[PDB]
């Protein structure tokens, strides 16, 4: 019961799920910058 | 058996290089290299010195120094790599070995493969085995089977040079 929930919380399941939810929901990246970087790479170094 | 991605070095053993010391005439070195009951014994004492040569530099991963369970099988094995000259029994004891092995009864068995420290054997050209004692303390020791498991290290055969591009007479 309660001990199972505490065990789960310590193990890192709940925390990881909450962090993933926060990151995914508020994930808003300026993809135009990465598009510009893509059109500025002819050297495989700058590719990786 | 054998480990993944590795091959036995039987095809890579140069018969010219191999030479045994203290081997009995009745049972020679060639017997210990065959997967038969034929075995190699040492005529004058329990100490034996078996050296093998490799056509091209080979890598050493695991060696199977099998022997009879009667007690005359190898017990303490000393190994050296890339010996410029033949080994003397008095000098062999003095020198430090590349990997001193104390073969347990399990290793001597037909299915027993004794691991070797792969790091040390990277450019082995000729490995010499010094059986310093047998399990049963018998007068003579025997080696039922013996071969090395590893990989062939690509070696430049400058004896096979030959121009592949360009015309003769060129200079610079």
């Amino acid at each position: 019961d309660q001990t199972l929930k505490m065990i789960k919380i310590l193990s890192g399941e709940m925390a990881i799920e909450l962090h993933l939810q926060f990151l995914i929901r508020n994930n808003n990246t300026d993809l135009m910058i990465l598009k510009n970087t893509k059109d500025a790479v002819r050297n495989s170094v700058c590719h990786t | 058996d054998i480990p993944k991605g590795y091959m036995d070095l039987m095809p890579f053993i140069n018969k010219a290089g191999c030479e045994c010391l203290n081997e009995s005439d009745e049972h020679g070195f060639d017997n210990c290299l065959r997967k038969d009951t034929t075995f190699l014994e040492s005529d004058c004492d329990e100490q034996l010195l078996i050296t093998v040569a490799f056509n091209q530099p080979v890598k050493l991963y695991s060696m199977k120094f099998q022997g009879p369970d009667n007690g005359q099988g190898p017990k303490y094995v000393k190994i050296f790599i890339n010996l410029p000259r033949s080994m003397d029994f008095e000098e062999a004891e003095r020198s430090e070995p590349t990997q001193a092995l104390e073969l347990t009864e399990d290793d001597i068995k037909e299915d027993g493969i004794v691991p070797l420290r792969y790091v040390k054997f990277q450019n082995v050209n000729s490995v010499t085995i010094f059986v310093q004692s047998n399990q049963g303390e018998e007068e003579t020791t025997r080696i039922s089977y013996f071969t090395f498991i590893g990989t062939p290290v690509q070696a430049t055969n400058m004896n096979d040079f030959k121009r592949v591009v360009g015309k003769k007479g060129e200079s610079h």
Binding site: S44 | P57, P84, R85, T156, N157, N159, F161, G166, H172
Partner: protein
Amino acid sequence: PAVDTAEQVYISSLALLKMLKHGRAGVPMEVMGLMLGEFVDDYTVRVIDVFAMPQSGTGVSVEAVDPVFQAKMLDMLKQTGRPEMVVGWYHSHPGFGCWLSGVDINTQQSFEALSERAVAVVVDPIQSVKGKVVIDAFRLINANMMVLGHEPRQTTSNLGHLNKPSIQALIHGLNRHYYSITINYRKNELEQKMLLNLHKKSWMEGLTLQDYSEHCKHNESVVKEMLELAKNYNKAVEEEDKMTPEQLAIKNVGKQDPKRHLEEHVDVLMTSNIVQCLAAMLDTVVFK
């Protein structure tokens, strides 16, 4: 597959010395020899020994590798304890820098036929005349992959772009037909404590009192020139022209009176005198 720009041709201390000596013997011509080492792994080519091949009218070409000479040399070196493989070849480019010509490229391809990693080394005994050692390691760039893929070397690391290509190598075909390999010098102690003996200075040199005659002459000359320099420093400081003094100190910069020919001489004089006096007292104490 692809060669990493992180590959490093390890050249041993003995190998570099032998290659330089062989190159300096041949000048005004071109010498060549096979390099003995190991292809320890994909990102490293280690050369331990280099043995010169006899000079021949052919020059540095596939026919300079006398098969009988090479075979007997390797066979006899195996007995001594050097069972190394042929990892590459080296040839001296007197005058011109480290690059590869057409015949050089053909010989390099012939070597590659045996092993895909047969590095080629070029050493110029004339350029390497001072603390600079102009030594380059070159291998052939499959002109096919020039279009099939793109460049020939993966850049998985930064261990290779810490070097710069040379206009010479670029003109003669660098990054086009040949690509350089970073040359790392494998030096160890014993081989570095033995080489600090070329000029090690005997204990006696550190107890010789020089000679007092030329010591006095040197002291007198330095003191007279320092008196002249002190006159000049007097003139410079007492002037102290304030017409933008920050600009004055920059419009009279010529390695002159103020401090350069100044206390430099003070240091010379004081070092010489202190060392001489300390040596004299150490001798007066040690020797009776």
